Amino acid sequence: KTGTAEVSSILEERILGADTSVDLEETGRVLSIGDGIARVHGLRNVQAEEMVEFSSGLKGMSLNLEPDNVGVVVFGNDKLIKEGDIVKRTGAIVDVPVGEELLGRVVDALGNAIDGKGPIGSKTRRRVGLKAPGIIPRISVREPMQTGIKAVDSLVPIGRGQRELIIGDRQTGKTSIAIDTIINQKRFNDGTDEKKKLYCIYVAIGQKRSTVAQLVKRLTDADAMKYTIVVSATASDAAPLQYLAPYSGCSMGEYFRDNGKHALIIYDDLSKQAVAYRQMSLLLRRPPGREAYPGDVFYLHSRLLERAAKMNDAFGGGSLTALPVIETQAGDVSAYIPTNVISITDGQIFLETELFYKGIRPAINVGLSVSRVGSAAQTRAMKQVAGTMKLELAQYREVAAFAQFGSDLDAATQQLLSRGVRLTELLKQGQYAPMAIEEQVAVIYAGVRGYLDKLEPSKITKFENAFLSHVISQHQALLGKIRADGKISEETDAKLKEIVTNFLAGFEA
Amino acid sequence: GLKAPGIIPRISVREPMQTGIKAVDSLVPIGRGQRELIIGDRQTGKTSIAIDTIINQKRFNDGTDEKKKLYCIYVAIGQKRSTVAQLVKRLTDADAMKYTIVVSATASDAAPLQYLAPYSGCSMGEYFRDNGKHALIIYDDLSKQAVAYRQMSLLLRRPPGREAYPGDVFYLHSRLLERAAKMNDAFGGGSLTALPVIETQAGDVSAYIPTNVISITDGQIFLETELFYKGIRPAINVGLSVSRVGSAAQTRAM
Amino acid sequence: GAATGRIVAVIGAVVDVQFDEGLPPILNALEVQGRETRLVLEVAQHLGESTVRTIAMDGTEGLVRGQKVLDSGAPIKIPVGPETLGRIMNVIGEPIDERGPIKTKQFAAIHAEAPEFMEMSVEQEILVTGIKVVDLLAPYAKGGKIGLFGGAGVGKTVLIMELINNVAKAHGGYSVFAGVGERTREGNDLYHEMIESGVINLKDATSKVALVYGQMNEPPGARARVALTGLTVAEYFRDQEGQDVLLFIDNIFRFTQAGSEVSALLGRIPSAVGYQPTLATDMGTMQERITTTKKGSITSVQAIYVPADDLTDPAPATTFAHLDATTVLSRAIAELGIYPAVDPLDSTSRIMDPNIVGSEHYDVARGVQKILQDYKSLQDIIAILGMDELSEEDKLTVSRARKIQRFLSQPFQVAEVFTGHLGKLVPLKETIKGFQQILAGEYDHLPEQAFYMVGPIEEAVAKADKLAEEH
Amino acid sequence: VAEYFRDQEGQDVLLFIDNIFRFTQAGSEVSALLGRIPSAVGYQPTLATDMGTMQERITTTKKGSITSVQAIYVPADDLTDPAPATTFAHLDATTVLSRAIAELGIYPAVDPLDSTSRIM
Amino acid sequence: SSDTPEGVRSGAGAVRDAGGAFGKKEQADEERYFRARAREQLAALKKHHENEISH
Amino acid sequence: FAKLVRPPVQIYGIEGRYATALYSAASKQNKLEQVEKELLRVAQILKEPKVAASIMNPYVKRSVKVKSLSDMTAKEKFSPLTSNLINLLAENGRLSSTPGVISAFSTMMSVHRGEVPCSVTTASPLDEATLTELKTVLKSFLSKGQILKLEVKVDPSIMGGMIVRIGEKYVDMSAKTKIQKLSRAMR
Ligand SMILES: Nc1ncnc2c1ncn2[C@@H]1O[C@H](COP(=O)(O)OP(=O)(O)OP(=O)(O)O)[C@@H](O)[C@H]1O
Ligand SMILES: Nc1ncnc2c1ncn2[C@@H]1O[C@H](COP(=O)(O)OP(=O)(O)OP(=O)(O)O)[C@@H](O)[C@H]1O
Ligand SMILES: Nc1ncnc2c1ncn2[C@@H]1O[C@H](COP(=O)(O)OP(=O)(O)O)[C@@H](O)[C@H]1O
Ligand SMILES: [Mg+2]
Ligand SMILES: [Mg+2]
Ligand SMILES: [Mg+2]
Hints:
The structure is cut from a larger assembly and holds 2 copies of chain A, 2 copies of chain C, 1 copy of chain E and 1 copy of chain F.
Chain A: H1 10-16, E1 29-34, E2 37-41, E3 52-53, E4 59-65, E5 70-75, E6 88-89, E7 95-97, E8 106-107, E9 125-127, E10 165-168, H2 174-177, H3 180-183, E11 200-205, H4 209-221, E12 228-233, H5 241-244, H6 247-252, E13 264-268, H7 273-281, H8 298-303, E14 321-327, H9 337-344, E15 347-351, E16 364-371, H10 382-398, H11 413-426, H12 437-449, H13 460-473, H14 482-485, H15 490-493, H16 497-504
Parallel strand pairs in A: 8-12, 10-14, 10-15, 11-12, 11-13, 13-14
Antiparallel strand pairs in A: 1-2, 2-5, 3-6, 4-5, 7-9, 15-16
Chain C: E1 5-10, E2 15-18, E3 30-32, E4 40-48, E5 51-56, E6 68-71, E7 77-80, E8 88-89, E9 106-109, H1 134-137, E10 145-148, H2 156-166, E11 174-180, H3 186-192, E12 209-214, H4 226-240, E13 244-249, H5 253-256, H6 263-266, H7 279-286, E14 297-303, H8 314-317, E15 325-327, H9 361-385, H10 394-407, H11 428-440, H12 466-469
Parallel strand pairs in C: 8-12, 10-14, 10-15, 11-12, 11-13, 13-14
Antiparallel strand pairs in C: 1-2, 1-6, 2-5, 3-4, 3-6, 4-5, 7-9
Chain F: H1 13-27, H2 32-39, H3 42-45, H4 64-75, H5 82-92, H6 98-110, E1 118-120, H7 131-134, H8 139-142, E2 150-152, E3 162-164, E4 171-173
Parallel strand pairs in F: 1-2
Antiparallel strand pairs in F: 3-4
The complex binds adenosine-5'-triphosphate (ATP) (2 copies), adenosine-5'-diphosphate and magnesium ion (3 copies).
One adenosine-5'-triphosphate (ATP) sits between chains A (170-176, 361-362, 429-431) and C (350, 352-353).
């Protein structure tokens, strides 16, 4: 044992006299810098988790308060800090700009501007490190949140104020479930109603810069960057900027929660924050654990993913929904970080690369996916048809082995091989085409009721596209009688019988 | 501790190196100047393969031309003296010992003497190669030059890596297996083949020290056990025994 | 000279120096005196009482404690410019080919920062190389980033030296080959494979390539900085001149893996399976300087060693995000004689899109991949039921799928010394047409041995007539 | 809280813990923030004593008793994992709720072939 | 241990991924079929080619 | 921070941290040849069955070992920068290693004019005519304006010579030369 601040220059002045020349209550010199971790002699009044501000213009964050020095992580390059550089205080935990002057802008994890339009014009701030609401200021979730995907809205539904984990292997369609979740909201976000709007945030952690640049151009052309904030700690940065970047984006989306509005945040992905924390711990010499993660790494993703809440009428009526993204490695959902975040959240959506090549895109596994809330977070019409649909696509999975070499089976088993392969063909869907909700209640009503059994399975994905363009134009008055009433009455249940059968005749030509 | 030669003073592999095995010379040929890895288990044929090669060059060494000879070198690491004093017997009835050297670091030696042995044996090989002639060198084996580096550099208080091996076991084998050159003809044109032996556990080739030395050598010879026992002896997997053919210097009639 | 330090502790390849007057910053260069060769040490940490912790770039033999150390005032300064073409260069920018010195008028320090968000060209294109698996299933892009995966001995130095033949001779812009730790034998072929092929000219000034070679007989601190001497010559051609460049690097796993060889000697606690705790940070510091800005373009092809065929290893699985196009070579395919070994169901590009490549290219390559995943569900039935138990529809699947699998193979021009065949170079319009017909049924009447190692589909019927005449 | 209705009142207390794995997982986080070297698969060295000093305070004394009912999560379907191995050493029963018995219409969803009791 | 996402499962076409004595019993069984159809087809080529000229 | 004067020994450990912070602080104001006279007077009052009874006692108090030595170090003779140093060691917890620092400061201050003596190791001692040469021919080596010192230790296992060590030199002439006749038995 020697102690860190027992070097030959610290002791040397104390033999001379009292330390009046430097005060050490407010400014402290640096002992030793290396790999983005500094050691500072002095700074007696520094609070834990307080920003400091180095001599070369960079910033910091105080994490280790030790009896002779303080260890502070550095934002930015380390070729600007040296040994003997005065450090000062700001006097607060880190804060970020917040308002509605962020909408349509692209910000990094400290609230600055990168898209080159101009400086942000907000007049408010917020600390990144605040707490969740308690047991009392919430209420059970009841609001639909629509994605536009026939699988996600009918088999594993999301509500407002819920966590839902997008988990799956590489190259599977993860970033694209959460990019027409955004584009689908333009239906509601230009109209006149206020309790159906939504304001989306996208957080990019550790991606390369020119995948973000291919995303501000995907969303501008589809006209959804007038209500979308983009927070981007990319890969070339320092490691603590990628550590703050989901807290920096979960405080930007809490102002929309405290004020009776709604929001939705997409962490992409949470398996690169947890590696950015681990680099910072094991250079601060905090003791490791399993897979060299520190002990408090369940404490990273538990205090973050519990700030998504559904508040109540006496607090404003806000919301916040979170979709975190996690990448496994060859179907191994039993590693360390993929087993923390499955325990925290409220369900997962599981995408496989075997189904991606067998012709099923979006490549969703239905058997290994769940939402814990489920049928309460659906509209009263999507609840009506999917209760017959989720059951019948579940009976197909038990007899799914017989289909390879089978014709000498029972007529009941030859039926489940028939009906189950039509419903699989309905759920296919092209990229960047979200659907309105009452239109999906048209398509799914055709398959599950019996109006597709007399057709050929390569003619299912043609019939759906020809059934929709006939019902948008020549029946627009009946796709607003579900979007208003909500529930399919019998006066509409008898009218769609006279549309599908009076179209199934004049189709096959 | 000398340095391997770079990019200018080499040339490609023109010549053949005949082993006299018939599964080697026809199907998996070996040029002169090419690092070839004999890999397999214990008691499958790894030493015998590299001793028929020592014997078989007897016919060129009593011949007349000075460019068909092949002077040989055997490095015994971690072997008991009642195997190395018995291999000098097998190499002296056939009069094989008049053209080889045996550098010997037995299992009784100090652990810094089993580490220094292949770097000393390879440096007698480069008397030949840096003066014109053609050499050949067998490391028997190189899984015992690694556990003499793991022990010697744990007691110097150096922090362990994987399986308590140091950080630079890849740098340990790579700075060795790159001196096996084939010089151009404006330096002398000499060659230095190398035949490293590697013992693996339970026939698993995805271990730490195997895969670090598969990817230094041009080709391999995969010796198995179910070939040895069914009857194929020398037990060479001719399906898997791939070889960058060495500019295909097999020979014209073969 | 400034801060002439002194050496105190040479433990491995990690030398610590102690400065009397002036401490240098992180990432500098230091010059050890009194040696007949040039040994360069780069600063990495500041320890207290004016001692730094460096890393040598050469051999640490003969380092006596108390030895003076100068300082230059900057990171390592290489030569750069137009006169670096047809040359081979060291990590610290020196000649290693014995042709004399590099006479340039501009130096570039190898430590720069990634260009910002507002300097990002967004456009996609297509690029045709000539191969029926690249151009059909994982197509390239003019300016994209391309990674070649796969284990040891599957075909990565051949597939990267065939694309040097195909693209980098019919190209107007320039190319750079950076050799980050590979066999010094293989760095003598490509120096001589391109002197006879006109890409290097040893008497006049019309060469179109530059070489950077630090190989696997080098200490593991110098096998971490030839990845950065590469994309400093390959950035002066993009930024300063407004040109177009190609970037060839083999192998880029030796940049990561040579950072794990000095992690614990520096003083860090090692992470998971043995790598340094700064894996995805030192990597992404480098793989963001290889981008196409709005001043030029870079088309980068990098070979990526997968250790022990384990794709879920942390050194390859953190590289799958810095790339637009992945071509993954397997070994269970190249054991069947199929060459190029490229896996059809594991390669993937971004521009496989019905709005860039067209809605005829897209419907083909999503039926090749759909009939090959239909094959594997039948191979588990054949292992029990045998081949002559299947129905007559499923027999038609296996025959076309084996016709498609053999037709994906193609004789490269650099296999004219290995196999003795003759080389092909198939255009794109024939590639789409040939595969469109095997799925239709217009070649159901041929033997499979016609399709093995041909070019266009019209050569695969000129073989089924020679087999029937010599019967 | 559960002992005042055993000691100071003499009644038959119940006690629900949800769940017995997050008690165990949180002990391994405290023990690794202090610096103690971990056990088998990654848990803390004091894994059986820490469960001991909690599970031994639930007995039937002469005044009253405490009963307990604890939910268990079995990680990676591994019934010989160090955390459910140590918890099974203290159990006197099991109850299994399965997905299939709910489909038959039977409530509560109890599997009568895979639910045990040591005092049988 | 298969009725759980945590419990491991298998892929499609994994029998020939191992390399056992069923992956060999199937790799050879396919060559003992598609070598003998390669000379039913081969013999008919002379006639088929002629037939094309005829019509 | 500032730069400091280089001590000509540069020892390491918990001694040479504090024993260089004292050399650098006292070489300022040219307090060097004085302070060794004061460090040899605390080098006698440390060995006392009331002072050493609580200079190494753990259980007295963290604070009362600071006022008890500060009252002690000032009143009797001296108030230089050593009074801060004894207050510096006691404030940190390094009172146990206090005799180590002064034995470390002494070897650091000795080389400012000293020699690090030689060690003649021969036999039973000798006369004046053969010793005053070796106390003068050992001065002909160094030649840097210095006044030499020496140690003597008698050993008979060396049968017929003398070994001497000027610093780290070791010119050996002894009966090791029987083992050097292995070359007669070494072919
Ligand atoms: N529903 C779909 N239909 C057709 N193609 C799709 C669909 N979803 C995704 N793709 C294709 O998948 C490719 C890659 O998908 P994407 O990159 O969004 O998935 P990812 O799993 O997030 O990949 P990564 O994790 O590497 O970012 C894209 O090129 C896109 O064309
Ligand atoms: N060509 C051969 N044909 C038949 N048997 C052979 C042949 N060569 C060697 N053997 C036998 O195989 C056995 C093992 O050979 P060898 O000693 O070379 O194996 P090894 O793996 O080198 O042994 P170790 O594991 O001790 O190094 C010996 O008993 C030897 O007699
Ligand atoms: N056209 C070809 N396709 C596949 N493999 C080939 C071809 N021609 C030769 N080979 C063999 O495949 C091996 C591939 O090794 P190579 O690509 O050189 O190194 P790497 O280990 O980096 O893949 C070569 O040794 C060569 O013998
Ligand atoms: Mg993505
Ligand atoms: Mg042997
Ligand atoms: Mg290669």
